[PDB]
Amino acid sequence: AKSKNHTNHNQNRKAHKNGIKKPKKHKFMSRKGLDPNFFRNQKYCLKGIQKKKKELKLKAKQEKNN
Amino acid sequence: VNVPKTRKTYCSNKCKKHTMHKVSQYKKGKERLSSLGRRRYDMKQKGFGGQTKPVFKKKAKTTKKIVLKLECTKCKKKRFQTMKRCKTFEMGADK
Amino acid sequence: KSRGKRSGTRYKFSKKFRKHGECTANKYLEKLNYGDYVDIVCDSTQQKGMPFNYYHGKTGKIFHITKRGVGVLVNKRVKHRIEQKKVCVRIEHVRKSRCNEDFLLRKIKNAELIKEAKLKNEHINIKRKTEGPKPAAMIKVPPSKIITIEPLPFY
RNA sequence: GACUCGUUCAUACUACAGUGGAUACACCAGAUCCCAUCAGAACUCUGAAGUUAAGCACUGUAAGGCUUGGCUAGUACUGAGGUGGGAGACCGCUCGGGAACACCAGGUGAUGAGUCAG
RNA sequence: GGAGACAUAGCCAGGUGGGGAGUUUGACUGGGGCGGUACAUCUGUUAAAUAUUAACGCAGAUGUCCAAAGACAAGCUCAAAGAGAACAGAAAUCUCUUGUAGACUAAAAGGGGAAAAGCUUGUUUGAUUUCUAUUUUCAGAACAAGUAGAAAACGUGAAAGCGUGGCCUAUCGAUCCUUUAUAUUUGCAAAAUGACGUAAAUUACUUACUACUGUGCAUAUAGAGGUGUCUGAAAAGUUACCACAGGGAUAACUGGCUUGUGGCUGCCAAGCGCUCCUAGCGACGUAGCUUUUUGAUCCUUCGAUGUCGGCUCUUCCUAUCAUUGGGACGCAGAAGUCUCAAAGUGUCGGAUUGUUCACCCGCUAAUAGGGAACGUGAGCUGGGUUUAGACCGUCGUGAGACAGGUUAG
RNA sequence: ACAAUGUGAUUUCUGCCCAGUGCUUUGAAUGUCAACUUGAUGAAAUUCAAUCAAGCGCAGGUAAACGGCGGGAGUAACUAUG
RNA sequence: AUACUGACGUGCAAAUCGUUCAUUUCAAUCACGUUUAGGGGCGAAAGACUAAUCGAAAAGCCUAUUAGCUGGUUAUUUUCGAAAGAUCUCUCAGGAUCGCUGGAGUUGAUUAAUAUAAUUUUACCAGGUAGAGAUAAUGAUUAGAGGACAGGGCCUUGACCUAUUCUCAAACUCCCAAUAGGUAAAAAGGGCGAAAUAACUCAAUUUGUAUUUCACUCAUAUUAAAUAAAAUAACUCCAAGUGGGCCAUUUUUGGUAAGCAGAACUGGCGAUGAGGGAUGCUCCUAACGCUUGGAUAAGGUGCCUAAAUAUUCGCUCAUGAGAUCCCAUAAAAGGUGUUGGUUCAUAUGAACUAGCCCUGAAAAUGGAUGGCGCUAAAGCGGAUUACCGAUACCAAGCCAUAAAAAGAA
RNA sequence: UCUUAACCCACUCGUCUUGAAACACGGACCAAGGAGUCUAGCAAAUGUGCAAGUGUAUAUGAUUCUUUAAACAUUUUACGCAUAAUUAAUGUAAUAUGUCCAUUGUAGAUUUGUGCCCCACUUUGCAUACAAUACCGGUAAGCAAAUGCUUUAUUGAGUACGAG
RNA sequence: GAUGUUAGGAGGGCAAAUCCGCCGAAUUUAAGCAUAUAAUUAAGCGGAAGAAAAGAAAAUAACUAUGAUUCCUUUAGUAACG
RNA sequence: GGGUAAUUGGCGCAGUUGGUUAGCGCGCGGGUCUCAUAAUCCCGAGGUCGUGAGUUCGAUCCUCACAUUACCCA
């Protein structure tokens, strides 16, 4: 039975009520789909730097211990 | 639509290389009587109470998707290839 | 009724008068680094990588680059909320933005000005002026040059 | 003077003229081989006998076009206000923003990298 | 007596089976049914210069076609127009000049395209396998259609490159089930099925060691068979013999808005009116009024506003028919036409029809027009329309249908 | 006679059509068409074939069975009609 | 049991009464006994009848059957407080799921701050609607002028060109606003350096990339532009109700129009009183604890009716004046009514013009500027004051709620 | 307090409804009765006990036997849920022995210090948010004779000192 | 095989909560309904007892094996059916 | 979908592993009073694709169209 089929009316009024929400703007994010090649290279880089840093920290600690 | 009967293509199984395949048209064939679904259906049907299921009867489209069967000559392992529904299909016909 | 991919795009995606014909060769050379700002301007001399209507005239950060593709983080208003959308486009439509460059230029100019001021120990209001009211002044007008007026009769 | 790569992509175009060819471009000479055809026209190859006639460069024209600027015009239009006007159609005022074609005047290029020749 | 291993009966099995049973018999819908699909979609437009966005709005399209119309490279430039060349004419082919697209691009319509995306030619099959990040609609689910990549293997080009279907925007399908593919992946519930295989060993219930081990059924993974009421019930009619839950979310009745339609009044003045615009008229045109018509509408009433007409009875109106008083005239009188004040007073007998209406006949002074919930059913009447019975036709296989008639109610 | 219908005294008449749907009659020449049976294959389950049921189909019969029962043009001393 | 559609119709009766009428030796009537029972009986057939019960009797049970539908659905105060959109739905009176709401909690702010904002700014974009155009393209489309191909006799009709011309388009576009929209404005960062790390990159173990580690150092005593009862914020959970809506300005599509149908933006109304608009769901004012005084808004100030029979300059007589947004009708056309203008001519004749006024102006119960009334207006148009006038505003009290100070003799 | 007055104001409540004082419906009156419950299973919230466990089930035992049909008690692997996941499945199953240490970041509460209290440095680095790596089950892909292997992909309601 | 008022005895009916045989629905659920569902329920009809029925392995397991029947606690909202 | 049968010259039909027909018709010439008639031309993707063999329209296989019956978890 003939009944009004659309209107955007009042929707805007509801929408502003809790404000137009923003994204949460995270600094880092997942790199999952992003470029194979470059990110696998990076994984190696991080492992390399981390390994050097760990070895130096251990060396300082064991040396300090005596 | 008309497709030639042999085609040099990548072979998925027991190969890595592009090689020749023979091309044929898939067809459904007779359902096996002892297949599980048919057994259950036969049991439901049996005895009183008349027809027991839906029957897919409304019937709309007048075509059915065409599917090519690919067989590699080098290694006897077959593979399916699906493409758009067409009304008139031909294999190996006139150029 | 229908709302397909290029729906309602008639004048929007069409080129301006005398601007038909292939994307200029020079335009592929432009530099894109991660986190650079980038406009999404449609073309139609290229067909692959054409984006949907909404991302026309929008601008966002570049987050990912491929062989000829560029991922752009664009804000989209969806009812009560903005959410971030990853529009993959090809290079022909992606254009290096200028809005960032105003700020960047300002930083460079400010740094030099600040370094000199601080060296002299001369305290300074580096922040933007943001046009104030008009200050008082004294103005010579020749008494023979002034013209006097009245509203015109009707015709 | 000239060239090779380009850039802006008509102030760079087009149409009709004139003016210019050290070196350079070019037209132009030829067909054995590579090559290409219906056709050495093109293309390819091999030349260097001729020539500014053209291409090309440069300039001209109450040129067309294109391009700046004025002027069209505070006109057209318009955001906000109004227990404003008007029977209605529509039209003012207050706070604001503000065009276009035509027309008229100017303009007809600029330039990055490399190279050769007095 | 007769019939007799046939009957019959018992159980299976096919047919027949509205005789009887159970059940269903979309939705949208400017009432419903009929028509249509606006139900899945795609273009342009409506849409109000981001995005958004409606009506059974408008102009349309979709359920395909394609081994090339796909893929890549190369070469070439088209439509058309002019001027030419036996047959040769507007068309035939050939040539030159002009030719930014006026062509062609599978198909709607809009975009895009000239050393091409077009046309011609060469070589080909990437219209491939596997996997992401995602866009569109959107719940930021699904399918579908894409965009950007990655791991493979290739195709083309000298090479950069480009190629993961069609220049871009449309061309479509869940679960169960079936079906056929894939695998050095698995199962069939206490066990076994290649094979006593390969070595040994002794005479046996011997020891080591082996990715590959019956039929059938099942899984896992991947397609395909279809649901167009297109996010997916297997579904025909009828009731004026009917019931019940509700609905003024919704028709048939008034009133209400509007007044297309009807009715009534204007304004213009080309003409008509013997000559003469206006005595009387008045086209071509144009402005209003009215709600006595018919519509459009669906605001009010469906836990009932008694649904036509006649009879009777009263009052109101005036857009005057008569009567009274006037004015104008194409007015001699007479007869009369138009017109102004006028609603005081009046406005009939019948034939025929259920009739509003209509048509006659006759009287007449004239037989004006209307209103009051279409005035008037606890005033009547009940002829009509609108219950159950019935008839005839057409229509329907039927039950039954009929803004067709007719009769008892 | 029993059963089942239609019509409805008398009188006078009871035309056309078996295509459609019914109803109905023949059959081992005959297409299909079930269980069983019977053979073949297989280690077996299975899987295959084959046989004279009726029925329908094939060939007829039937309207006091249901029912049904056309359209355009042109043509006569006037015109008209046909 | 026919007719009176007679009596009665809260009856004499849940079918009676009066009068009229059909029936009487047969298909006749009655009594009693007897037979047949509920999807059954029986029927000279009306779906009739089967004990006031029949298109499926009566009784009890399955059974408190079932109902997306109707009605109802119980003390107070206090706090916060909706929706009538959206997607899918054999879906349009429903449901699901989003949206919008409350409670609970944590995190964070609690440092006039950074986060942040229905805002502007300065930068920077993106646009193709109003508009504008036709001699810019496409489609329309009216005219002539000047020229060098077709029919007839230099000439005629042309076609055809060339420069022009009149008017145009939601589905035309050279060009093109306003409004609306996006991105920008620095410390988890940015600078300029060094050094490291990688299987990536590149010719390049240093060619880059990116990360990482060290350095040096960028505004901050107003805060890398303003402004901000800007953290009353984030975020999580659990759940509600709702998913029929409607009206005004402005934009707007269909329709002759409509208190009509359909949209866009915003505000309302709904759920909202109070003061004003006489009267009223939506108009104006203004949003409401309880009070006292003050001063106003919107609106008024002849009386009804609280304020002025105020002041000041005009206009207006109507034998159907006129009088307040929405809002409760009036036009084309006339006027030797009066009032101003404006243009012409020789203190007049002409021609126009717009104020009020008049004509045009007809409807039904009696009758409505809100009523009485009003003409030196209480009318119409101004201007000037003064005043009266709300649950709004200011001051003060009192209440609760919310937060804040702040407290273990 | 009640009672009339008087000025001014003041429409039938309930109700479904876009809109009710309605020519919408229900209500003659009065009194009493008269409508979101109970169980099952699940969830979150919050309270409470215990805590890698937890619940003492059914049942037994007691000088427990009006109340008591409750309370009390339970000789050093019963069962539920938890404690580990994942795959259709035979099944397989969490860094890894260089170390009783407890994967890496960036923010980030709490702490230490310096130059009894605001600062600004430093210092430790929770919760949590965002990532990143490892590794486990399934699946790919590469290899393959094996206690199957792999630097690579993926997928899971997975894991990285418990929380029920 | 009959027959007997032969001699001695027995069964019939009432009562149903629990209990045992049959026979057997539908409302209902699925937002419709046809298979399923309601439910081996209700109604119908037969038969017992102070309890009845069941019971002394044609059982389960696949273990270091258990060991008539019934019931409780449980496995378990699981294997499974649809 | 099963199973069966039918499609061969203008028309209508036979035939199947050592074959492309017969009749009607058409065309044309010959012929008895006019025709019946004889003779010769006409004139064959044997529905389609592929295979099996000395040899196939024929047989095996493939497929469409027409026909008749029956199935319809499709």
Side-chain angles (χ1 to χ4, degrees):
Chain A
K2 190 151 288 182
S3 301
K4 73 107 86 72
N5 289 285
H6 183 50
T7 188
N8 190 44
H9 182 82
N10 205 56
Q11 277 287 104
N12 215 34
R13 186 77 84 95
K14 293 161 64 192
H16 290 82
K17 202 174 180 197
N18 284 299
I20 307 179
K21 306 292 289 185
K22 297 290 168 58
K24 253 53 64 179
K25 307 182 181 183
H26 311 319
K27 184 173 178 185
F28 312 100
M29 84 308 175
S30 191
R31 47 181 62 161
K32 184 188 179 185
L34 287 66
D35 197 63
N37 293 346
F38 181 72
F39 279 101
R40 65 172 62 141
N41 190 55
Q42 290 304 324
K43 192 175 77 164
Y44 299 142
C45 307
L46 181 58
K47 193 167 294 181
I49 297 163
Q50 187 282 313
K51 187 167 293 299
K52 183 162 286 190
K53 189 177 181 182
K54 166 61 182 180
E55 187 173 71
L56 294 172
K57 184 174 181 178
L58 181 65
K59 170 187 175 177
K61 201 68 173 182
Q62 307 288 252
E63 195 72 55
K64 190 271 191 295
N65 199 81
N66 294 291
Chain B
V1 183
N2 182 44
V3 182
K5 306 198 74 178
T6 53
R7 285 197 293 147
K8 175 167 161 294
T9 195
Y10 171 73
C11 179
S12 57
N13 290 59
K14 305 286 164 53
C15 276
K16 287 164 164 54
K17 206 175 185 76
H18 285 60
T19 188
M20 188 173 284
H21 282 225
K22 302 190 71 176
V23 184
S24 190
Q25 191 183 168
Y26 162 84
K27 287 195 170 189
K28 187 187 159 64
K30 186 154 74 74
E31 55 277 74
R32 290 140 52 235
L33 187 59
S34 299
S35 295
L36 191 65
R38 172 54 66 122
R39 309 205 302 235
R40 195 189 288 106
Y41 176 69
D42 207 61
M43 290 288 275
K44 275 296 205 70
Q45 183 65 10
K46 200 169 197 297
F48 287 118
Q51 192 51 251
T52 58
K53 287 279 182 179
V55 179
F56 313 154
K57 185 176 291 188
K58 199 62 55 177
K59 197 72 153 59
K61 59 190 56 52
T62 192
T63 63
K64 296 174 184 285
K65 295 181 175 183
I66 198 71
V67 41
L68 303 176
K69 187 179 298 198
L70 315 182
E71 188 184 297
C72 176
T73 51
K74 301 295 183 183
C75 55
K76 292 282 178 172
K77 293 296 179 167
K78 293 173 283 172
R79 189 261 287 202
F80 273 56
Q81 187 196 299
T82 181
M83 55 173 274
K84 303 297 189 182
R85 47 169 55 98
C86 306
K87 179 154 45 55
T88 298
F89 183 65
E90 299 182 296
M91 213 71 95
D94 308 69
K95 212 66 171 52
Chain C
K1 191 178 299 196
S2 71
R3 282 185 165 92
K5 295 196 209 81
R6 278 191 64 188
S7 46
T9 52
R10 185 160 199 258
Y11 304 98
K12 189 172 259 69
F13 277 34
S14 70
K15 278 289 173 68
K16 204 164 202 279
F17 186 51
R18 302 153 66 194
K19 305 295 181 180
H20 291 267
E22 293 184 61
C23 192
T24 188
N26 197 310
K27 198 264 151 294
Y28 292 108
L29 289 166
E30 299 186 291
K31 299 191 297 184
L32 306 176
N33 299 328
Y34 290 167
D36 289 352
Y37 276 80
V38 84
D39 316 313
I40 296 176
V41 184
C42 296
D43 204 291
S44 288
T45 54
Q46 168 58 268
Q47 314 307 331
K48 296 195 162 191
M50 184 181 286
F52 180 73
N53 302 21
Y54 173 75
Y55 300 100
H56 196 299
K58 311 303 182 306
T59 297
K61 299 196 297 180
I62 301 175
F63 74 94
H64 175 250
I65 296 172
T66 63
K67 297 202 295 181
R68 292 91 184 99
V70 184
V72 185
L73 302 175
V74 189
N75 298 323
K76 188 173 187 195
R77 182 169 177 196
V78 187
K79 298 179 173 181
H80 66 170
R81 75 184 185 248
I82 307 305
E83 68 185 68
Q84 187 169 254
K85 297 177 59 62
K86 295 182 184 74
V87 189
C88 288
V89 294
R90 211 172 103 138
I91 287 158
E92 290 86 346
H93 306 146
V94 109
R95 180 183 71 180
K96 183 60 164 292
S97 204
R98 298 192 67 197
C99 45
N100 194 266
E101 106 178 304
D102 184 276
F103 183 41
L104 184 57
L105 170 57
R106 195 191 312 147
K107 298 192 178 182
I108 299 171
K109 173 184 177 180
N110 289 359
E112 185 71 291
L113 207 168
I114 285 164
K115 183 182 176 182
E116 293 298 295
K118 200 171 186 180
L119 184 62
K120 296 178 181 184
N121 298 263
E122 185 176 301
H123 195 57
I124 197 159
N125 303 104
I126 192 62
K127 51 162 49 171
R128 289 186 294 176
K129 195 76 169 183
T130 312
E131 60 181 62
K134 193 169 296 299
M138 178 51 156
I139 298 167
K140 179 192 170 184
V141 175
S144 54
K145 188 174 174 64
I146 196 157
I147 306 297
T148 192
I149 200 57
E150 277 291 301
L152 305 176
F154 186 71
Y155 296 115

